[PDB]
Structure formats: C-alpha cells, structure tokens
C-alpha cells in the first residue's frame, strides 16, 4: 500500500481538449487506410474554435484535417456540439505489428480560426487491425500465434513501483527470447508500459483490476448487482485510459472472479464502446458468454480434468466440443514455479499443429521475491511468510522465468 | 451404399463430374433408395466409394435428402468433407498424424474436428486396415473415440478375406488370391483384408 505511482500537476486551459479517440479502418488489401479522430472539448464553445489533427511519419507530414466542432446527427435531439470527428486518408500505410512496430505521430491541436493555438495533444498511432474471423484471431488479416507471458509489476527493492529502466529491461529480455505478447497480470499497468510496447512491438492484453478468488463461491460479488458499479468503474476507466494504444489488442475483464451477470454486462459494454478489440475472460469455465476467446488456465494438451462445474478439457478436445467455434489462447499455462516448464514442447507442437490453437501466455515473467537483509547486512531473496505476515502462501509468489533482478532461469 | 466406384479413372471424378454419366449414377442411387427405404436397420445412405467429387454427387446427395429426410447421407470421395456428405468420413485418417496430400489432405481425426467452420460428426468409413497381421494401434482409435464426443466411431476394413478355393494336383483345397487364376494385371494378396478367414475362422485381431 501507499502512493506507489507518480504524482503530477497538470495545467490546462479553461477551453481544453477533454478526450480524443483514434481509430484506423482499412480496405481488403490494407493498401488504403482511414484514420478517424474523434475529439471532445470542455469549456465554452466558440464559433472560431477549430481542431486540427495532423499525422506525422518521422519529420514528414502525411495527412491533416481541420474542422469546426459539431458532430453528425446522433438521434432525434441532434448530435454532440462539443465533439468533432476528422477522417484522414492514408495511402499505403505502414502497418504496426510486433515484428515491425511502425508508428505514426498524431497531433491534435485546439486553435482559433485565425490560427492561434490553445492546446496541443499528441499520441502514437499504429495502423493495425485485430479481428476474429472464422474462429481465428487475425492481425492485419493474418492469423496470430501468441508467444505470450504474464507479467506482474514487481521490483525486489521498490516492491510494486515501476521505473522506465526496469520496463525497458523486461521488454528487451522478452523480445530476445521470442516473446511477442504480454498479459498485464490482473490490473492496468504503469502508463509508460503501453507506450514502450507500442515503440518496441509487443502485443498487450490489458486487464481490469478485478479478482475475487477468495470469495465462496468465487462469483459471490460478481453475481451481485450491488457490486456492479465498482466493477463497471474498474473496467470503463481502464478502457477510457488505454483505448488509443496500438499495442493493446485484447481487453480482459479480470481474473478468477467466477462468472456473474456483471461480467456479461461489462463484456457487452466493452464490445459496444470499443469494437476494434476482442474481449476475453477466464472465470466460470473459460468459455462463457463473456469471452470472445476460450482462455483456460493451465488446461493440458491431451489430458482432460473434469472438475464438477468448471471442467478443464484438454485444449484439443475443447476446440471440437459441439457448438464450439472460438479460438483458444491459454491465458495462463506452463507454470514456471522453480524448476518447471516440462512439457512445453508438447504445448508448442499442438500450437503449430492446430489452427485454432493460437498460443498462450506463460505464467509468468518474474519472481515476486523481495529483498531482506541478514544480521551481517547482506541481501537475500524472501518469499511469503518471511516478513511475519498473517497466513501466507510461502514460495508460491515465485513463478517467474527470470529472477527478481531479471536474471534468467534455465527454462527461459 | 450405391454401386458407384470409379477409382481407376484419372482424375477419379472424370465420369462423376460429367453430366453424360449423371443418368447412370442417378439410376444406381434412386433404385437402391427405393428398394431399401423401409428397412429399420438402414440408418445412413452412402453415395458410393472412391469416385472423386463431382456435381453428380451433389445432385444425388440433394435428391436423397429430398426423398428420404429420415437418414443422413455420407460420401468419402473428394476429401471426405465436401458438400455431398452429412458426416466427415475419411478413409484411414490417423488419430494424431496429419497426412497433407496436395488436394485431398488426410488430417488426423482430432485436428479435423476443430478445423475452422467444421461442425459435422466424424465417423471413419474405413479405418484400421486388417490385411494379414494387422490392427496395431486400434486402442488409440478407440481411446480417441471415447474421449472426443464428435468422434463417433468407424467401420473396420474389413470383415472377411476375399480369398477363393483352388485345388492342387492331389485334389486338395487351398486359399487363392489375385494372380492365382492367371488373371490380367492383378493386385495379389490385397484382396484379403478380413478379420475372419474366408471360411469365417477368426483372425487374432478379431
Ligand atoms: Na495454431
Ligand atoms: Na465419441
């Protein structure tokens, strides 16, 4: 607990940019793209007010659009007077991916009609398309094979405070080991992380901060409409903060909270607000109506685990179940606690043999070990119960492919 | 099964993709259905065997579906999963190994079920070739059968050896196969693929 992330002061004009969303549509061959930029304003609207969106490739401008405020008709009462949408045509766009993170710079400028600037906002824009077609997750029209890992925000000395040096270290180490995707383990991450994944090329699954694993039953609060406002806040604010990042390709509703009506409501909300990304959720059997992807936790390649209400099928048998059409990506597999990752080759043989088996996220990246000091003042790695803490789960906090200081395990 | 096989045609659908042979195939299908449509033991109609995939097969499958909706129709030619079958019915597809032939791939039966867009049940029209000392890996097929719902079994090839009785100089009978009668280019002992001998004596694989 504490103030573990950065605190800052922001000064904005009275008439200001309050919100903006960037969207990229494409044609069939991806030779033509449209950048849709929706900008919202706060303060008193004036007729001289303008918004310009310019797209930049390096130092070269490739597109620009200027318009006054006032969107199209939405319903019988009109449209948003304090909003504007710009459509920038891009011919032969350079496509973002994990292999080539081609990035554009979009600058949103609030300015008067005579030309004076009031406030500028900028974001990195990647031209990519994520969709599930015929049971396969496609990126830019091609089926994806997720070489993913779950990552917690952990530091052996600073706890859960993240710095840019450690983030860059983690991303470089992941890409040097042929990882192309990262799952934000069970909460939204430090904002710089998404930017770094945009610049370096990692696919990101962004997860809402919602876990109720210790509830009996697990959906006790997530099936209660009295907790729907809290969960809805935790989902909507994450999407609103991170919806512009090209590295974010999949939304996650959370982790291990059973399956309730709140999950269905929030999945539908995400699908309505941001149709450009699929939504996944594992709780309740990993194949409910609140997931676009079958995402089992630690399902095996060939052995079924028929638990009473939430069976864990083998991933090959799961695909062929009557009525099943969705792709399967394991949200957690190949538990890396200690001397682990036996049978990894079996998972990857199945991944390359079955089309709709589109990979998974290894659990997990780094051991959540802390640094204590002995009587001689020397540091050592500590796990659960080494601080005197009330009933603990000992060494089950260390499931990483690298040590806390980011030294690789042999399983890496 | 209708009396329609064109295995030796090159390509196999040379006549079954020709509308000049549609009347003959249609007779061979319609008269079989008309004769046998009242029998309760008959649960599945088959369009034939190893004749490629042509428009004649599609036409006759649709005819059977119109005339007798109470039985599904299956057909293996053309890749065992075309529009002329209600059931994926591969010949000798394996449990775990894919056999990617250029135009008619033979997937493993577990991989076949999960192919994008695939919803049909899989019953092997021919599997576990019983030629001589055979049926190794039968337990693997039946493990997969009991583990995967849409894997609904198959038909072993086959029941009885098609061996004939010849007599030696001493007048004693012996089992003969292809080429023992002087017959023009033959396929030797490939006629004996049965679980029982010609006199219906069981093989050890039974
Ligand atoms: Na695959
Ligand atoms: Na079955």
UniProtKB/Swiss-Prot annotation, chain A:
Looking at the UniProt record, the site noted as Transition state stabilizer sits at 152, 186
Q: Name the positions where Mg(2+) 1 binds.
A: 211, 213, 256
Give me the residues that bind Na(+), please: 396, 399
Positions of the catalytic residues: 256, 332
What is said about its interaction partners and assembly?
Homotetramer.
Indicate the family of this protein: Belongs to the glycosyl hydrolase 2 family.
Q: Which residues bind Mg(2+) 2?
A: 392
Residues reported to bind substrate:
256, 332-335, 399
The molecule here is called Beta-galactosidase
Result of altering residue 152 to D/F/L/N? Less stable to heat than wild-type. Causes significant destabilizations of the first transition state
Swiss-Prot/TrEMBL induction comment: By allolactose.
